[PDB]
Structure 1
Amino acid sequence: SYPLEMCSHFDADEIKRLGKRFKKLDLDNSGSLSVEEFMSLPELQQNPLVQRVIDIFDTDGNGEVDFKEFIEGVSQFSVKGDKEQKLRFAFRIYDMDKDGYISNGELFQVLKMMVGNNLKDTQLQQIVDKTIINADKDGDGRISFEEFCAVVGGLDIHKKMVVDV
């Protein structure tokens, strides 16, 4: 009982398919996917950005991804999605506190999740300082989505942020 409201690029059929996968992933059949339910896939255990994706997906901040959240997060990757939506999603991978701005510490930590120990922290810290310095066209010492986009838009990485449902 009670319809579920959601915003997505998907049609009835696709939503029904996604619902099936959502069910297979929902181990404790709780109707909300958990980090551990996510980490149950071995392909994901060897991927540094799983917790960033789950967190971005987990829009109500309760720590799990409900069906509405699952569909809306997967929608960012629809082939029907626009360049901005995909870059916004990339932007949120760095924007840990969801304030709409990538800070120095947020930038260090997310990069640190990916570089690991191929860079000493001093080195990693210096390239984060200079990257922000050059991109921070407002002097607020943090990177807005606009400044972020000015830097990466030409890269067309959004063309690769597409999955099939």
Structure 2
Amino acid sequence: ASYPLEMCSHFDADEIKRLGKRFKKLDLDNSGSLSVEEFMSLPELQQNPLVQRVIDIFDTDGNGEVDFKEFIEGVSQFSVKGDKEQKLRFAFRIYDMDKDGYISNGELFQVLKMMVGNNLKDTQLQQIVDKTIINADKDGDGRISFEEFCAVVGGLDIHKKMVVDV
């Protein structure tokens, strides 16, 4: 009889139970945590360039794996009940690698590089990164806050795509 897990999410008891079943089946060695290697054992994830970024965001305690609390709170960002700001903040977090709350030049480059590969020259990519920052940086520190990020993309309605059924 272990201690209750505490979490915050949009899910009712039934949904948490169903997610629990998925968690267990994903947890191959049954350690109660989810390793990178366990995520990668799903062939459909092997060519997805954002997998490690998603895992980093889910792993809020930073021990390199995703436990059940983190799994629930991660998936909850994609609940149909989640708001625009929530989906957008998750998107912001894809770019914000070191999690300090500001997208920097180097991070924007690196994350774009993960997605673009060799479709652009490094010089080209640096130039569009530079201009994106300049155009979106409203207080002149050279990096992009969440507020400045939303002012740019909040009209795109991408949040309406970031939704899964559980």
Which of the five TM-score ranges fits, normalised by the shorter chain? over 0.9
SS of the counterpart of 1:105? helix
Deviations 1:8-29 (A, max 9, x none): 0000000000000000000110
Deviations 1:59-112 (A, max 9, x none): 000000000000000000000000000000000000000000000000000000
Deviations 1:103-125 (A, max 9, x none): 00000000000000000100000
Structure 1 segments (4+ residues) deviating >3 Å: none
SS of the counterpart of 1:164? coil
CA–CA separation in structure 2 for the residues paired with 1:128 and 1:151: 14
- Note the residue ranges of structure 2 that are not aligned, 5 or more in a row: none
Aligned to 1:132: 133
CA–CA separation in structure 1 for the residues paired with 2:121 and 2:31: 42
Count of matched residue positions in the alignment of Structure 1 and Structure 2: 165
Deviations 1:107-153 (A, max 9, x none): 00000000000001000000000000000011010000000000000
- Note the residue ranges of structure 1 that are not aligned, 5 or more in a row: none
CA–CA separation in structure 2 for the residues paired with 1:55 and 1:84: 20
Question: Normalising by structure 1, what TM-score?
Answer: 0.99
CA–CA separation in structure 1 for the residues paired with 2:115 and 2:53: 11
CA–CA separation in structure 1 for the residues paired with 2:126 and 2:141: 18
SS of the counterpart of 1:77? coil
Alignment of 1:50-65 (within 5 A): 50-65=51-66
CA–CA separation in structure 1 for the residues paired with 2:55 and 2:94: 10
Question: Normalising by structure 2, what TM-score?
Answer: 0.99
Counting helix residues as a fraction of each chain, which structure ranks higher? Answer: 1
